[PDB]
Write a protein that binds this ligand. Structure first.
Ligand code: HEC
Ligand code: HEC
Ligand code: HEC
Ligand code: HEC
Ligand code: HEC
Ligand code: HEC
Ligand code: HEC
Ligand code: HEC
Ligand code: HEC
Ligand code: HEC
Ligand SMILES: [Ca+2]
Ligand SMILES: [Ca+2]
Lengths: 439, 439
């Protein structure tokens, strides 16, 4: 494509300071296993890909590696195999706008994730945010322009300060895959009714959309994903239009005293002077302390919401086992769907305790309120089927125990994934090397 | 006494600007009936004085008037009559340090509220916060000193900025009346553990303390009251030691050009220049909009928490009615106690949406979590008693209907109060005038 250069090294000794700091996200290499740290999530996501594997994000340099390696994308043997579609590449690589610009959105989104393996081998890079070889910013994905239009803030009419967050909003948002034949597997941001948890809930309910049917409760479930842009808009910094870039890509000075934009996307406290100290006079120790306090508050309510949902899902499973009808279960499943949507949207962003802690805490409160409705209705229904005692919860104290409770063959899944990693990934990179040898 | 002057006019000509702005809290005279606006509260406080009458605070000039007029103090015919004790005067008048200094705490707290009628007639004034005829600040109540010592911040070692909030903390706190024999009727702040909702819950459970037994659920209840200091400490302004005085008693300039401390304690937005604008560049409309949005979020979770509690109380009443035993109800009552403690502390301060919105939202979330646990246990227990259908809630849509549901003879209460107002209060004021003549 004329508009995209997916090879990130092309403009490196033309834009040295930007390339070098961009490459330094490789320094953020630790992989924290969130399922291991919180096995409740295996149960909440039962029947869905996230019950297999879910880790915290690390540096942008690892995006293609991590989508390749997660158990969620499976072990496809050919371009028509594997569980997930092409759309799983969309926020991982500057080869995505290359493919969209050459084949159109309809050509890009067609088919399996495995199909794009040979084509999507460059990780998150310059062409995702920039015009080719230029410092100018751009939106490189058409579905992003559609989403910005939908909330009335098109990129073409946005201020410089607005665009700084919009380039991150290409990826750091809640999304779903459309179902209609002409948009099958297209990425869409569910923003037509607004970006609050309540508006998005109305959107999804209006089209009767579900990401999966829960393996225990049979609830039509919604999955939230990293809603940084939607939740940043709710926090006081976003209300002041303090941009993602102000904290995550701050203006820094070279050893020679030249200012440039720090491209090492990571922890803003690592550049405390240049980030928080730009606008605040408090010490780093104070502001780190405040941030850790909100993380603790959000975590407390997160676990309370999760404990209610775990019990709700097993209680619903027991209700089905005791002969509940679909009509008896319909209002309970609605409550479970909404309760878990609210928990998931509240904490799916690993930055929410910094970006919008009060919104996270409000939303987790509404989660518990819906879970309480579901569980009281379940307690009455279970009693009509003859059970007036608590429903037993199996041992789910570890990720391995939870996945086994669900009947998941983790040994086989890991073995097949390792064989895929060893056999298929070399072939993909060998094909990409051959193709890039043109260009 | 030597160290207190309760007549607030004595130094009016020496300190004209302070006296004049102090007297201007009489401009804040609107009375908002909180029970009328939220009749749920009648049910939540069933069996307690707050089910009778509860209004939003107004100006300091009305403290003695409102404590005289509230149905909560009833209609005493003599100094040993009436529902409430001497300690209800403690945060309403500079006559209180006068009586404490002359009679001791033991002498002051002894007896009924009606006994203090003739002695406590000056409203909140200069000697409550100041040394006599002086600009120096003081703590005028010994139980406040004990509380400050308990949290490790004695007034003697406090900074200027610390002391600005501490004078408000003499009254704007959660408290209880001790029941121990040697301290019976004493005001104490429940801060030994210290000031979060969770620490105070541990404090109260450790001494097996209850304010009343709920009229419906028979739960041993805790009542929260206006925890401004404790919640201010949790908000970001308090963490920065932005004092109550910075927003509510700002430095202003007289018409003659003289700088002084504004003593019109009221809405900080009424002094936007001089309060927020001294630290913030945003417009007043923007900051008002933010505070209004937080008020709405807090109100949304407040109402969800109350709906859960109202149903829990009626469901518990049903369980008792169906023959539940003490042992069956014990874990349910514990959950209701904690759930309502958390609700009440979260919203008992009318400023919590400005002072600490994130803490109010966290605490309201934990309220719903405990109410959930109570209602699920109740649904199972009700089913063991043969009831598998929802418990009916009577019409409680107005203050009047809710009080009638509880069997409250509001007509008699109001008649007896008006009679008390017409007959007793002139006698109290006449005796005080006679006594103050001898000053
Ligand atoms: C199709 C269902 C997929 C799959 C299989 C993956 N993604 Fe994404 N992704 C996006 C962003 C902003 C992040 C970092 C923020 C965060 O994770 O909270 C990620 C992260 C990942 C990972 C690493 C972490 C993990 O979950 O283990 C993996 C393995 C992963 N993704 C796989 C952004 C997006 C999107 C932007 C709209 C899209 C679409 C996807 N991701 C889709 C998928
Ligand atoms: C791949 C290694 C690159 C290269 C070579 C560059 N970028 Fe970026 N960039 C991003 C943002 C938000 C800005 C600020 C824009 C502005 O203030 O107008 C920049 C800035 C630049 C410049 C301009 C000079 C400067 O340092 O300020 C240049 C020359 C540049 N970049 C080169 C955003 C992003 C990304 C979004 C996550 C990504 C990816 C990149 N840039 C990648 C690259
Ligand atoms: C606009 C300048 C931003 C900002 C501020 C961030 N991103 Fe991204 N991001 C994407 C994916 C898939 C990941 C996970 C990577 C992986 O786990 O392999 C991330 C990761 C992050 C982080 C975590 C960094 C760390 O060191 O832990 C952060 C702080 C972050 N992002 C912020 C996806 C994308 C994009 C897809 C092309 C785009 C564009 C951005 N992110 C842009 C931004
Ligand atoms: C604009 C919408 C964004 C986006 C997309 C992100 N941020 Fe932030 N962020 C800030 C701080 C202090 C943290 C936590 C640092 C810590 O944990 O110590 C975060 C966290 C994130 C994450 C998660 C990072 C991870 O490794 O898990 C992500 C993906 C993220 N942010 C993206 C600080 C700020 C701001 C300061 C006022 C601003 C504005 C933003 N971030 C904006 C955004
Ligand atoms: C760097 C990572 C940080 C951190 C840790 C914080 N900020 Fe900011 N901040 C800015 C503005 C305009 C406000 C609103 C208040 C005001 O009008 O001054 C804030 C507010 C905060 C808070 C209070 C909100 C809360 O979370 O309790 C906190 C704790 C906070 N900040 C921490 C402005 C800016 C910036 C201007 C572009 C920048 C950069 C930052 N802040 C960065 C940080
Ligand atoms: C330290 C300077 C303060 C500040 C900032 C406030 N108070 Fe008080 N207060 C007390 C009582 C009994 C009331 C209710 C009076 C009534 O309704 O009759 C109040 C009221 C307030 C308000 C509401 C003002 C309004 O205009 O509505 C406000 C903003 C307020 N207070 C703040 C009791 C006391 C004390 C007991 C003697 C003392 C000391 C303080 N308050 C101190 C302060
Ligand atoms: C003994 C049980 C009583 C009674 C009957 C009253 N008080 Fe107080 N009071 C205090 C503060 C800071 C306020 C204003 C803040 C707020 O109300 O949220 C009040 C207000 C009142 C009112 C007017 C409002 C109402 O409830 O209608 C009334 C009628 C009232 N009080 C009666 C402070 C304190 C204390 C400081 C530790 C103490 C002790 C009391 N009050 C005790 C009582
Ligand atoms: C009853 C009408 C009075 C009078 C005559 C005065 N006060 Fe107050 N005051 C309070 C606080 C926190 C301050 C600031 C203290 C400081 O910054 O050191 C003041 C200030 C004064 C002064 C000093 C001159 C000035 O205007 O700054 C004077 C002479 C003065 N006051 C007289 C607190 C309170 C109260 C707490 C709620 C109340 C009640 C009063 N003051 C009452 C009076
Ligand atoms: C220090 C511990 C205190 C105390 C005792 C109080 N405040 Fe504040 N407050 C602020 C704002 C913007 C409001 C809302 C005004 C509005 O409703 O528009 C409040 C509210 C209160 C109340 C309730 C007022 C009422 O009339 O019902 C009370 C009793 C109260 N405050 C006492 C602003 C601030 C601050 C701004 C940074 C500071 C600090 C404080 N208040 C501190 C305190
Ligand atoms: C007058 C009643 C107000 C109002 C409405 C607000 N402030 Fe303040 N503020 C101050 C400090 C140090 C912070 C922390 C952030 C920082 O370090 O700059 C804040 C924070 C806020 C916020 C953001 C937090 C939130 O609740 O979202 C808001 C909305 C806010 N303030 C409003 C400092 C001060 C003061 C210095 C003495 C004064 C006065 C005020 N603020 C007054 C007000
Ligand atoms: Ca989604
Ligand atoms: Ca109390």
């Amino acid at each position: 494509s004329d508009k995209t250069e997916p090879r990130n090294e092309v403009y490196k000794d033309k834009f040295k300071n930007q390339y070098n700091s961009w490459h330094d996200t490789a320094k953020s290499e630790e992989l924290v296993d969130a399922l291991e740290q919180d096995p409740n999530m295996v149960i909440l996501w039962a029947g869905y890909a996230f019950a297999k594997d879910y880790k915290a994000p690390r540096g942008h340099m690892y995006a293609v590696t991590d989508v390749r390696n997660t158990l969620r994308t499976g072990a496809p043997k050919n371009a028509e195999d594997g569980p997930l579609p092409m759309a799983c590449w969309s926020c991982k690589s500057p080869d995505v706008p290359r493919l969209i610009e050459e084949q159109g959105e309809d050509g890009y989104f067609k088919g399996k994730w495995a199909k794009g393996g040979p084509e999507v081998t460059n990780t998150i890079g310059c062409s995702d945010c920039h015009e080719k070889g230029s410092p100018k910013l751009r939106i490189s994905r058409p579905y992003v322009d559609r989403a910005l239009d939908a909330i009335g803030t098109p990129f073409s009419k946005a201020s410089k300060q607005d665009k700084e967050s919009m380039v991150c909003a290409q990826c750091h948002v809640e999304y779903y895959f459309e179902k209609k034949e002409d948009k099958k597997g297209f990425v869409k941001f569910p923003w037509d009714m607004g970006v609050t948890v309540d508006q998005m809930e109305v959107y999804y309910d209006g089209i009767e959309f579900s990401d999966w049917t829960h393996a225990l409760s049979k609830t039509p479930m919604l999955k939230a994903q990293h809603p940084e842009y939607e939740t940043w808009k709710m926090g006081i910094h976003g209300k002041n239009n303090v941009s993602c870039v102000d904290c995550h890509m701050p203006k820094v000075t070279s050893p020679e005293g030249k200012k440039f934009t720090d491209h090492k996307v990571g922890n803003p406290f690592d550049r405390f002077e240049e980030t928080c100290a730009t606008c605040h006079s408090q010490t780093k120790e104070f502001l780190v302390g405040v941030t850790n306090e909100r993380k603790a508050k959000v975590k407390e309510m997160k676990l309370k919401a999760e404990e209610q949902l775990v019990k709700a899902h097993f209680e619903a499973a027991k209700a089905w086992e005791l002969g509940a009808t679909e009509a008896e279960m319909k209002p309970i499943l609605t409550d479970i769907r909404h309760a878990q949507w609210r928990w998931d949207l509240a904490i799916a962003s690993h930055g929410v305790a910094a970006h919008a802690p009060e919104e996270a805490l409000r939303v987790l409160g509404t989660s518990v309120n819906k879970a309480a409705d579901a569980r009281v209705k379940l307690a009455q229904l279970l009693a009509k089927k003859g059970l007036t005692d608590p429903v037993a919860i199996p041992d789910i104290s570890t990720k391995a125990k939870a996945q086994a409770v669900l009947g998941m063959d983790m040994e086989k899944m890991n073995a097949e994934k390792e064989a895929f990693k060893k056999d298929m990934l070399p072939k993909w990179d060998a094909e990409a090397k051959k193709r890039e040898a043109t260009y």
